[PDB]
Design a protein around this ligand. Structure first.
Ligand code: CLA
Ligand code: CLA
Ligand code: CLA
Ligand code: CLA
Ligand code: CLA
Ligand code: CLA
Ligand code: CLA
Ligand code: CLA
Ligand SMILES: CCCCCCCCCCCCCCCC(=O)OC[C@H](CO[C@@H]1O[C@H](CS(=O)(=O)O)[C@@H](O)[C@H](O)[C@H]1O)OC(=O)CCCCCCCCCCCCCCC
Ligand SMILES: CC1=C(/C=C/C(C)=C/C=CC(/C)=C/C=C/C=C(C)/C=C/C=C(C)/C=C/C2=C(C)CCCC2(C)C)C(C)(C)CCC1
Ligand code: SF4
Ligand code: SF4
Ligand code: SF4
Lengths: 165, 64, 731, 31, 74, 80, 74, 35, 41, 94
């Protein structure tokens, strides 16, 4: 319980929702054979639905009055009540991958900017160089922090074009 | 002798009007006559009109 | 051909445009021929007088129509079982079924049901009979005539105020804070103590007997002796009946907090106490600036002293006093921004804290008032930013503001616009992504896969106010906390009783749907602000147009050169921002209306479950609540909702018509008009008739303005019709 | 006690006077 | 998509070019500006994009409505 | 009747004169550029405002500017 | 009566679409407003803000508007 | 309402007589050549 | 062969191949690890 | 215009070079009967002045007000007619 939320394990609405979904799937399954293709597909869907509901209830997710899982997006609140995998951990994972792609693109652009013909390098990508920079982008946090503390990650305001006010 | 920077010297634009304000360009030629804007500067960044060269005065450019 | 008396250049135009532009530039006094600063200020002052007279006449008309064709007296006896009447209907085009269908609140003939809430307001302030309303209307009529005479008088040379008189900011602020704000609030407190409070207790107090009635049993003695606490001895009981004496009291300045159990609105004694405190504080604030009595402050020195060391803010606020006093657009922008924010505050406070008796029970009036004030606030905000841009392109002096906050904020305008764009992109990407994800999982029949982020921050703030529905036990949620014990015997009892009840709108319960809609609102606000700020900061010039300030605030474009310059002026930025403001206000009103629709019907589950995906918004709100509206008239008959159905289609038509001016541009129409002119000049009989003005197509800027006007009118009319018909056909 | 016809007539006359003052102000503003 | 088209039908090239100028400044501040100078879509291209999106959205809306209705009551 | 102005940044390329569809600009002798000629607008009364001259100017910023003002029967391009 | 009304609506929409397309084809070369429209080409945004405005004066723009009217008719 | 005949006279006056008079006067004034 | 590899390195070809590879990887991740609402490690 | 050949411009006859032709006009004073013409010009005697002709239009304005205050009731207009019963509303209202 965080904000009046009940765990999905003890939520009656959650169980009723699972029961209703499985019931609808079985109702659709009743109009087929026992080993036909549609019957097997419906059985697989039923198994997946049951596994999903069981996993959600076992993972400790919080359910509201409507019986659906709710996510806690607040450090500390999610860390002390065991909900860090809702938004905190996904935030870290995203930030890492997003920074990886961004750093790889930045390095490729800066590397090809020194070539005699950079526009062609932009429309016709250098596959080996792009591959090497994509691999190097995995250490983007360390490289970015080093460049920031080094002062080479920024451009002087006096060297950037600006409008005549 | 000759006024302004020599040909092929990197210069920075000081005219806020110019599309290349605060940007560097190469001095292509400098006219040695009483011309208001005798410094010809070429750029690697085309403007909105697709032009990459412009004329500037002696006080509108800074070496390096 | 000389109608534009204020513009000699426009008078020489031999086309119809002369008439058009002759009306769209009539109030731009600064651009008129032979205009000075003194004449400009004097004309604005007289125009202000005229506007005040118009407002007084409008209020007088409302009062007169309610007292002449309404049912105010009948509504007073039964405020919950009688629909207020706005005015009568005399339409020769009406048919017998239409005449019979519009007769409702016991009227002699067809009438219009009021939706502005004037009945509840007038009933709460003490008005009870039609004679009082008529007297108020006549008084407002005389007041309007007086203001008209004042406007005419101050235009004469003997009564013309000098330009320096208009620049006396200290004196004006002193009089406005101490007199326009403080004295007015004190007078309102006097009226509430002498009329509103006694009238709510079944005692009539009017001009004929207000001098023989004591507002309090102990008259004036406790006030002058200092025993002010004696004015809050016995307040109205929890079982008090409005307009009667059962369960009444004698207190006039209480602070119970909460809502009246019967009227579901704020206590009159609390509002009187509020106005008295506000009057005292405003008067005190009014005694601050220096005038001619050797004491007070000098705003110029205060601004020149607000310069932090280390040069973090540069020169600080040096020269800002003159920048604001000399420029009228700066003052208008500040006033518009403040007024728009106050309008939004008023809209947000009247539904959660009803101030008028029997107002919360009127679902139609509450929704209409909230939507009206929110739309007004949006339009006023757009105007504030537009005038800020006008200031930057017409009254900003870089030499006079060298190094202050204005020059510095203009020096890094790129960072501001870039961050606004980043915030808008983030909000849009994620709000749309979450909504689409929920829609996709809902379509595949797997609602358990929805991404429902709990609004823990807003819930925490709600718990800080006393709501115990989230188990936070924070400040006001804990009975043993210091703030809880401090106001334990003051306003906390009623405040908590009203905030912990689900029967009112005082801090409603929120969930994932509220989280998503709030982020959508944040998106609308950020994008609208980005457009307006970008237009105001780039008004003087950009890389594409370095000398934009030389072309003014509004101009069609700069030609197709340099890649194209369509919609490059600041006016165009405001034009593009109006669409976003309408969209944001639409989202806000949609959210408010749907949530209250579910709350009024005792079904919060509908919004709690269908608001997490867009299909629920389109099916459970728009399509579901439009059945009665579109059925106002059908091949079987018509009812009182036919007016709203017709207005619904009318708004749709105006909006679509605006789409023409918005999509089609000037070029096709010019050639078409030339062909039409040739046809007229070659048609017999019709040749005898000639045109005085050469017919030409609408201007580029004029076309954008006409299209925007049509779009906004259709938007407002369509939503007003749908809102009123949906909340009126059910309640 | 509904307002009588004489009250409506008096209100209309006062409105006529107010309109006269308004037109005078408008004329002064035009100048 | 249909509503999206409105953005390209009621706007102009100057506004987007200036907005792109500010975004370009942000990119230059971090040394990530591309050599292929970003430019707003031409006036003709803006009109083409707006009309293409308008028709795609409207036709697809009618397509979905028609197919769902006829497949559910046919 | 629009306002057409020429600035000293002109290089005398004569492109604006050739791009004018109503013969509003012309080249006159000058001594501030290598071409020894400057542009002028003696017949601004015939200017329609097409801004074709600006689309042809190669200087940055433009050396020829058109400011649209009071509209007349000629500036509006009306044949009726 | 409903069929009569809808048929006249169809005729009106078809006529407007024909008017737009035919006007573009007939004035694609020249016009009273722009006597040298053929020199500017077939697809150009305009001819500047002069003459009150020449926005969407080319034949391509007429096709651009005809697309909207055709969508409405169909 | 008191004086039921008033709306039947004021509505046509404000919607038919006043608009026609105002439009005619405005049309005659915006094309005076010498105001 | 050099020209063919240069054509395959163009912006559209590389964009479509990268999008296809990313989409395929995501589809297989969801095929083997379906209904991943939270990051359960 | 002196269009005797292929010349459609003439400064001495510039009137004909600008297409200033009546095309269909024809001057003829022999048509309307004298007795009927006199009757009509006599009927519209003083009605040729702007102030007087506007007075005739002012009569139409009076007729508009007369219709609302009398004509509308004489044609049994639905708005000027009576009303039958009424309804209660959605909930317990009026
Ligand atoms: C993004 C804005 C934001 C907001 C609105 C909140 C709000 C909240 N945080 Mg929080 N927090 C944030 C960012 C935020 N946090 C970030 C970025 C971090 C990482 C450093 C944390 C780490 C954090 C911890 C470790 C804790 C909270 C806690 C709390 C709750 C009570 C603390 C409080 O506000 O008392 C007043 C705050 C003052 C500064 C005074 C409260 C609802 C506490 C909690 O879980 O509640 C029991 C808790 O211990 N937060
Ligand atoms: C005590 C002296 C005094 C007073 C009472 C006023 C009063 C006024 N002045 Mg004035 N003025 C003064 C001194 C004073 N002035 C002096 C000394 C100078 C020279 C320095 C000026 C120079 C001056 C100028 C140049 C102008 C005025 C104007 C005005 C009018 C402002 C517009 C308005 O009516 O909105 C009314 C404002 C309020 C009622 C206060 C607003 C309170 C908030 C915003 C509203 C919300 C409150 C509440 C919630 C509303 C609920 C009601 C709801 C139930 C309906 C106003 C009546 C302007 C004008 O209109 O000219 C006619 C104007 O142009 N004054
Ligand atoms: C205290 C409020 C206030 C004041 C005093 C002003 C004053 C001024 N404004 Mg401003 N403005 C305001 C608020 C205000 N504004 C707001 C809230 C907005 C946002 C909409 C704007 C947006 C705005 C813009 C974009 C511009 C101005 C401009 C101006 C200046 C000239 C105005 C003019 O030309 O008149 C002319 C008045 C009109 C043309 C009337 C407009 C017609 C309306 C919109 C149509 C309404 C139709 C109606 C609703 C249809 C009913 C529907 C029914 C038929 C079914 C002037 C000094 C102009 C300027 O500064 O020039 C450089 C300028 O361009 N204003
Ligand atoms: C539904 C219509 C619509 C939509 C979706 C938008 C969306 C947007 N507007 Mg816009 N606008 C509209 C109507 C619309 N507008 C109208 C009618 C007007 C009046 C003309 C304006 C005027 C306007 C102005 C003046 C500005 C914007 C801006 C913006 C952007 C704000 C940033 C943001 O919100 O991030 C979120 C981004 C989105 C919601 C876009 C969706 C992303 C897509 C769906 C992801 C792609 C996935 C997939 C691969 C699709 C490709 C398939 C294809 C290859 C086949 C945004 C992209 C501002 C801006 O540029 O911001 C910097 C800006 O200044 N708008
Ligand atoms: C799991 C699904 C999902 C998907 C499909 C997306 C998709 C997207 N996200 Mg997003 N995000 C997600 C989950 C997801 N996100 C989660 C769970 C979080 C945690 C709450 C975030 C938080 C997040 C942020 C903060 C941002 C995005 C942004 C974006 C957009 C560009 C991302 C990018 O890397 O571009 C390409 C990469 C670059 C162009 C350069 C790298 C830029 C990254 C984002 C900066 C990372 C390093 C930096 C120091 C981090 C500090 C950020 C600061 C605010 C604290 C994109 C459409 C960005 C956006 O909205 O654009 C305006 C944005 O800034 N996301
Ligand atoms: C619902 C919106 C709307 C409406 C009403 C119109 C209406 C019209 N369009 Mg248009 N158009 C629109 C959207 C709209 N368009 C959009 C979004 C685009 C962008 C693609 C275009 C692009 C476009 C082009 C390119 C052209 C038109 C043309 C026309 C005109 C055709 C002539 C006609 O239809 O006869 C009659 C008019 C109507 C049926 C409109 C409704 C009028 C009602 C029925 C009369 C009501 C009388 C009134 C209430 C009484 C007075 C009351 C008093 C208070 C004033 C017509 C007025 C064509 C044209 O110029 O005409 C040949 C033309 O070429 N449109
Ligand atoms: C701005 C306030 C306002 C408004 C919006 C209305 C609106 C209306 N009135 Mg009303 N009226 C008003 C004030 C107002 N009145 C006042 C103060 C009085 C007291 C004298 C009256 C007395 C009155 C009577 C006796 C009647 C109406 C009637 C009507 C209805 C038909 C209009 C008509 O023909 O009557 C004509 C209205 C008048 C002769 C007086 C109105 C004068 C106002 C104050 C002019 C205000 C102009 C405004 C401020 C400037 C805006 C510019 C604009 C003119 C372009 C209509 C709904 C009729 C009705 O009941 O319909 C069923 C009816 O018979 N009114
Ligand atoms: C910012 C918007 C956003 C966000 C945050 C999410 C987030 C999520 N979506 Mg969703 N979705 C979105 C938009 C979004 N979606 C939109 C617009 C659509 C319509 C096309 C969908 C349609 C959709 C469907 C149909 C499904 C999801 C599912 C999921 C969940 C699966 C996580 C996963 O893939 O496992 C983990 C993945 C990884 C660990 C890979 C990370 C490494 C990658 C390769 C890096 C990428 C670099 C570039 C996840 C919580 C699935 C689910 O089960 O819901 C719970 C699912 O079935 N989404
Ligand atoms: C509310 C305000 C109402 C105002 C009413 C104004 C009425 C018009 C008016 O007074 O005109 C004043 C003019 C003044 O004329 C003047 O008449 C003068 C003679 S006398 O003064 O009229 O005797 C004469 O000397 C002078 O030349 C001439 O200008 O008088 C007339 O000539 C009006 C005669 C109208 C005859 C036509 C009536 C309609 C005929 C319809 C035909 C078919 C119908 C079936
Ligand atoms: C552009 C421009 C302009 C305009 C501008 C604008 C329009 C602005 C605005 C703005 C706005 C619109 C703002 C708003 C705001 C708000 C704020 C700033 C606030 C706040 C806060 C606080 C401080 C609070 C606190 C509290 C309390 C008191 C109690 C309870 C709790 C709380 C927390 C709530 C000008 C002319 C001027 C200048 C130039 C140009
Ligand atoms: S299309 Fe119209 S607005 Fe755009 S540049 Fe051409 S004339 Fe100006
Ligand atoms: S705007 Fe057009 S007509 Fe005027 S000078 Fe330039 S090219 Fe000539
Ligand atoms: S186009 Fe520009 S540079 Fe060339 S002659 Fe004209 S003004 Fe001078």
């Amino acid at each position: 319980d965080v904000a009046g939320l009940t765990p999905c394990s003890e939520s009656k609405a959650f169980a009723k929702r699972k029961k209703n979904e499985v019931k609808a799937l079985n109702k659709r399954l009743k109009n087929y054979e026992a080993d036909s293709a549609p019957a097997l597909a419906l059985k697989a869907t039923i198994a997946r639905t049951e596994a999903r509901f069981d996993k959600y209830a076992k993972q400790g997710l919080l359910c509201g009055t409507d019986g659906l899982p709710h996510l806690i997006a607040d450090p500390g609140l999610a860390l002390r009540y065991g909900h860090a995998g809702d938004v905190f951990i996904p935030t870290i994972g995203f930030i890492y991958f997003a920074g990886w792609l961004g750093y790889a693109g930045s390095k490729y652009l800066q590397a090809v900017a020194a070539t005699a013909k950079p526009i062609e390098k932009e429309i016709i990508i250098d596959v080996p160089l792009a591959w090497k920079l994509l691999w190097e982008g995995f250490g983007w946090p360390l490289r970015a922090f080093a460049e920031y503390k080094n002062g080479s990650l920024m451009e002087d305001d006096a060297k950037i074009t600006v409008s005549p006010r | 002798p000759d006024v302004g920077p020599k040909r092929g010297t990197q210069v920075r634009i000081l005219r806020p009007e110019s599309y290349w304000f605060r940007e560097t360009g190469k001095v292509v030629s400098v006219d040695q006559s009483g011309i208001r804007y005798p410094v010809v500067v070429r750029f690697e960044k085309v403007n909105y009109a697709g032009v990459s060269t412009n004329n500037y005065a002696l006080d509108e450019v800074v070496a390096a | 051909k000389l109608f534009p008396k204020f513009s000699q250049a426009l008078a020489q135009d031999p086309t119809t445009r002369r008439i058009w532009f002759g009306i769209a530039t009539a109030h731009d006094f600064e651009s008129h021929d032979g205009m000075t600063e003194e004449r400009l200020y004097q004309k604005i002052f007289a125009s202000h007088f005229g506007q005040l007279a118009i407002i007084f006449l409008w209020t007088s008309g409302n009062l007169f129509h309610v007292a002449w064709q309404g049912n105010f007296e009948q509504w007073v006896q039964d405020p919950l079982h009688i629909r207020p009447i706005a005015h009568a209907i005399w339409d020769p085009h009406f048919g017998q079924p239409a005449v019979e269908a519009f007769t409702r609140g016991g009227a002699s003939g067809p009438v219009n049901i009021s939706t502005s809430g004037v009945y509840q307001w007038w009933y709460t302030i003490g008005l009870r009979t039609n004679q009082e309303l008529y007297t108020g209307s006549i008084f407002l009529l005389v007041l309007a005539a007086l203001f008209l005479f004042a406007g005419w008088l101050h235009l004469q040379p003997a009564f013309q105020p000098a330009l320096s008189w208009f620049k006396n900011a200290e004196s004006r602020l002193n009089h406005h804070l101490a007199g326009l704000f403080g004295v007015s609030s004190l007078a309102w407190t006097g009226h509430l103590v002498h009329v509103a409070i006694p009238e709510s207790r079944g005692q009539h107090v009017g001009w004929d007997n207000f001098l023989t009635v004591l507002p309090h049993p102990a008259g004036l003695t406790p006030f002058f002796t200092g025993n002010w606490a004696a004015y809050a001895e016995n307040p109205d009981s929890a079982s008090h009946v409005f307009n009667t004496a059962q369960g009444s009291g004698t207190a006039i300045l209480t602070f119970l907090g909460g809502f009246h159990p019967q009227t579901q609105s704020l206590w009159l004694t609390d509002m009187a106490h509020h106005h008295l405190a506000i009057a005292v504080i405003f008067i005190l604030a009014g005694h601050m600036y220096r005038t001619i009595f050797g004491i007070g402050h000098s705003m110029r020195e205060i601004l020149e002293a607000q310069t932090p060391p280390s040069g973090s803010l540069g020169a600080g606020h040096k020269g800002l006093y003159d920048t604001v006093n000399n420029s009228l657009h700066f003052q208008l922008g500040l006033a518009l921004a403040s007024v728009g924010t106050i309008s939004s505050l008023v809209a947000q406070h009247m539904y959660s804290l009803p101030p008028y008796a029997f107002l919360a029970q009127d679902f139609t009036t509450q929704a209409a008032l909230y939507t009206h004030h929110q739309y007004i606030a949006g339009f006023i905000m757009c105007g504030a930013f537009a005038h800020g841009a006008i200031f930057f392109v017409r009254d900003y002096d870089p030499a006079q503001n060298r190094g202050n906050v204005l020059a510095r904020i203009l020096d890094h305008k790129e960072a501001l616009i870039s961050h606004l764009s980043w915030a808008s992109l983030f909000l849009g990407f994620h709000t749309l992504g979450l909504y689409v994800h929920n829609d996709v999982v809902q379509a595949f029949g797997t609602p358990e896969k929805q991404i429902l982020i709990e609004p823990v921050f807003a819930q925490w703030i709600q718990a800080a106010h006393g709501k115990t529905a989230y188990g936070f036990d924070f400040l006001l949620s804990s009975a043993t906390s210091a703030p809880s014990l401090a106001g334990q015997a003051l306003w906390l009892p009623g405040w908590l009783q009203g905030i912990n009840s689900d029967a009112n709108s005082l801090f409603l319960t929120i969930g994932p749907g509220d989280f998503l809609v709030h982020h959508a609102i944040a998106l609308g606000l950020h994008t609208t602000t980005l457009i307006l700020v970008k237009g105001a900061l780039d008004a003087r010039g950009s890389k594409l147009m370095p000398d934009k300030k030389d072309f003014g605030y509004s101009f069609p474009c700069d030609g197709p050169g340099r890649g194209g310059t369509c919609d490059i002026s600041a006016w165009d930025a405001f034009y593009l921002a109006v669409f976003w403001m309408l969209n944001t206000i639409g989202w806000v009103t949609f959210y408010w209306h749907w949530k209250h629709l579910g709350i009024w019907q005792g079904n919060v589950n509908q919004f709690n479950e269908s608001s997490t995906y867009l299909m629920g918004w389109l099916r459970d709100y728009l399509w579901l609540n439009s059945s009665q509206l579109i059925n106002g008239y059908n091949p079987f008959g018509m009812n009182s909702l036919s007016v709203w159905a017709w207005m619904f289609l009318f708004g749709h038509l105006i909006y679509a018509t605006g789409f023409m001016f918005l999509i089609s541009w000037r070029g096709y129409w010019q050639e078409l008009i030339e062909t039409l002119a040739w046809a007229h000049e070659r048609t017999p009989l019709a040749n005898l008739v000639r045109w005085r003005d050469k017919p030409v197509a609408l201007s580029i800027v004029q076309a954008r303005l006409v299209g925007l006007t049509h779009f906004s009118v259709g938007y407002v009319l369509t939503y007003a019709a749908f809102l009123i018909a949906s909340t009126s056909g059910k309640f | 006690m509904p307002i009588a016809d004489y009250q409506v007539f008096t209100a209309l006359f006062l409105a006529l006077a107010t309109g006269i003052f308004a037109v005078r102000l408008g004329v002064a503003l035009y100048k | 998509v249909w509503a999206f088209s409105l953005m390209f039908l009621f706007s102009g090239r100057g506004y987007w070019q200036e907005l792109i100028e500010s975004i370009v400044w942000a990119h230059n501040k971090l040394k990530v500006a591309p050599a292929i100078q970003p430019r707003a879509l031409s006036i003709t291209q803006g009109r083409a994009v707006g009309v293409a999106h308008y028709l795609l959205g409207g036709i697809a809306t009618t397509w979905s409505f028609f197919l769902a209705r006829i497949l559910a009551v046919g | 009747s629009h306002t057409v102005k020429i600035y000293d940044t002109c290089i005398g390329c004569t492109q604006c004169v050739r791009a004018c569809p109503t013969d509003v600009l012309e080249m006159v002798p000058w001594d501030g550029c290598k071409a020894n000629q400057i542009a002028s607008a003696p017949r601004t009364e015939d200017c329609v405002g097409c801004k074709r001259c600006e689309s042809a100017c190669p200087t940055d910023f433009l050396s020829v500017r058109v400011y649209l003002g009071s509209e007349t029967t000629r500036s509006m391009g009306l044949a009726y | 009566t409903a069929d009569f009304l809808v048929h006249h609506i169809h005729a009106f929409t078809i006529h407007v679409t024909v008017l737009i397309l035919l006007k573009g084809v007939l004035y694609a070369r020249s016009s009273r407003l722009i006597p040298d429209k053929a020199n500017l080409g077939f697809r150009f945004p305009c001819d500047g803000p002069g003459r009150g405005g020449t926005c969407q004066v080319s034949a391509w723009d007429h096709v651009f508007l005809g697309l909207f009217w055709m969508y409405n008719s169909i | 309402m008191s004086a039921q005949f008033l709306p039947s006279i004021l509505v046509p006056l404000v919607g038919l007589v006043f608009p026609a008079v105002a439009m005619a006067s405005m049309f005659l004034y915006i094309e005076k050549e010498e105001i | 062969m050099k020209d063919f590899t240069t054509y395959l390195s163009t912006a559209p070809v590389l964009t479509l191949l990268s999008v296809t590879v990313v989409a395929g990887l995501l589809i297989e991740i969801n095929r083997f690890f379906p209904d991943a609402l939270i990051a359960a490690f | 215009k002196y269009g005797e050949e292929s010349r459609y411009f003439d400064l001495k006859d510039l009137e004909n070079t600008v297409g200033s032709w009546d095309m269909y006009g024809q001057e003829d004073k022999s048509r309307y009967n004298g007795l009927q013409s006199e009757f009509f010009e006599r009927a519209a005697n003083g009605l040729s002045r702007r102030e007087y002709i506007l007075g005739l239009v002012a009569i139409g304005g009076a007729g508009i007000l007369a219709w609302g205050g009398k004509g509308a009731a004489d044609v049994r207009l639905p708005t000027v007619g009576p009303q039958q019963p009424a309804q209660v509303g959605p909930r317990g209202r009026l």
